[PDB]
């Protein structure tokens, strides 16, 4: 969960669903 950007957060959330 070491994101630090909107892209990282976006890819992380999208993958989880």
């Amino acid at each position, epitope marked *: 969960g070491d994101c*630090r*950007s*909107s*892209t990282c957060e*976006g*890819l992380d*959330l*999208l*993958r*989880k*669903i």
Partner: antibody
Amino acid sequence: EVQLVESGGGLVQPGGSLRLSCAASGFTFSSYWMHWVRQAPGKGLEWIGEIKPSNELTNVHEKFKDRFTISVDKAKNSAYLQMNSLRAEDTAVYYCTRTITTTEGYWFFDVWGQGTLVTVSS
Amino acid sequence: SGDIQLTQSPSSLSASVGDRVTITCRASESVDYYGSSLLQWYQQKPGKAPKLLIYAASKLASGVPSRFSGSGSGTDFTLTISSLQPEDFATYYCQQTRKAYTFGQGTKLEIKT
């Protein structure tokens, strides 16, 4: 209603500096990634960087990293872009915008400001 | 630059009300992720800010007319405007969110009278 209002644009001599403001309204700021995007006259759109106001995490594109800084004033619900050592290539309409995420997980720029013009004259 | 480059075709075009038009967008690398294509289409009216039309290559943004449709995957995308309306004349940009944020160079659509 969600709104973004830019101010601070004008004519600047090369090597000059300028601070742009983005006043956000109709939503509390802190949750969202706030961005600066520019558009050279008659040209395409270029992403400068982003800021998350709550923790002030900032990511500026490599191209602008040495002269452009993004900051926030949470009390004023505003984002700022500090531009230094301006060159002719910085002449553009500067927009602030935000990214939102849908229930399906897609994120994109939804609301934009009206834009402010920065002209780097001789 | 290490950015995902987006190249649109054509650079500008003209057509009449009722015509069908297509604008293409080619990415330097795939903009896909977990079966989704992270590709948006924006419409920019003169002197105004860009307005989202399509997101995730084929999804219509709320309130956007059905005459606008998006297709494609990987590195090749198309924006189709069936039956042009007078208000549809603007500069169109494809935009990707797979890696940071980039935009195509823009395609100017003008009315032919």
